[PDB]
Structure 1
Amino acid sequence: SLFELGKMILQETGKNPAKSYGAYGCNCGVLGRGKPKDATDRCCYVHKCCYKKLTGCDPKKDRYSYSWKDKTIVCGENNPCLKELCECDKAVAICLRENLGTYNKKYRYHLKPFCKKADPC
């Protein structure tokens, strides 16, 4: 759910997730994709495409288990959908941390109404 996802982004990046990524560019935040504005935004574009494989679980509401071991996110077994959900969330948290070097506050509440329509995943 958003709780695990938010916690992973905070563990990897050290940033408040909602403030930094709740509404960044064309893909981080409220729903839908759009052409990405930069590398951070493209992490979120990839994360929303990753959610498309899920069947039987809901990425916003469903909780799942994971732990922090040797400063690494480790998804627990869960069930098949929840395990895929946990790995989609872990990958976006890692990708946001890898791209913090180009993060641009000017994209923070970017105007989603103006985003180019996203290509198919």
Structure 2
Amino acid sequence: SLFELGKMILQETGKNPAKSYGAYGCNCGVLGRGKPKDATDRCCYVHKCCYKKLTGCDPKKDRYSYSWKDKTIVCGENNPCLKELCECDKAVAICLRENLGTYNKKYRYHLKPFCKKADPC
């Protein structure tokens, strides 16, 4: 769910997930996908595609378990859809952290700017 996602983002990146990734480039946020603007944006693209692959479980609503043991995210067994959901979110948290070096606040928006069409997932 958004809950786990937001938390994982904060645990990995150390950044306020809404503030840093709630409206960033073409893919981080709640405005679907678009041609990634940079590596961080690109994490969000893969994440949104990760979500498309899920079957049945609700990526926004459905809670799942993960542990943060040794400051690494391990997705709990869950059921397959929830485990995969979790893996999607873990992936994007990790990728965002990984790409903090090129994170660029100029891609943050209030209203979403220009985004060419993303490739189909």
Which TM-score applies when normalising by structure 1? 0.96
Given that residues 40 and 102 in structure 2 are in contact (C-alpha distance below 8 angstroms), is that contact kept between their aligned partners in structure 1?
Answer: yes
Do residues 31 (structure 1) and 31 (structure 2) align? yes
| Number of residue equivalences | 121
Alpha-carbon offset, residue 110 of structure 1 = 6.9
**Distance in 2 between the 1:28 and 1:14 partners?**
16
Which has the higher mean CA deviation after the structures are superposed, 111-120 or 50-59? Answer: 111-120
Q: Which ranges of structure 1 fall in alignment gaps of 5 or more residues? A: none
Which TM-score applies when normalising by structure 2? 0.96
| Residue of structure 2 in register with 1:55 after alignment | 55
Paired residue secondary structure (1:18): helix
**Distance in 2 between the 1:103 and 1:22 partners?**
13
**Distance in 2 between the 1:112 and 1:47 partners?**
18
Q: Which ranges of structure 2 fall in alignment gaps of 5 or more residues? A: none
**Distance in 1 between the 2:91 and 2:48 partners?**
11
State the identity as a percent. Answer: 100
Q: 1:113 to 1:102 in 2, by over 3 A?
A: closer
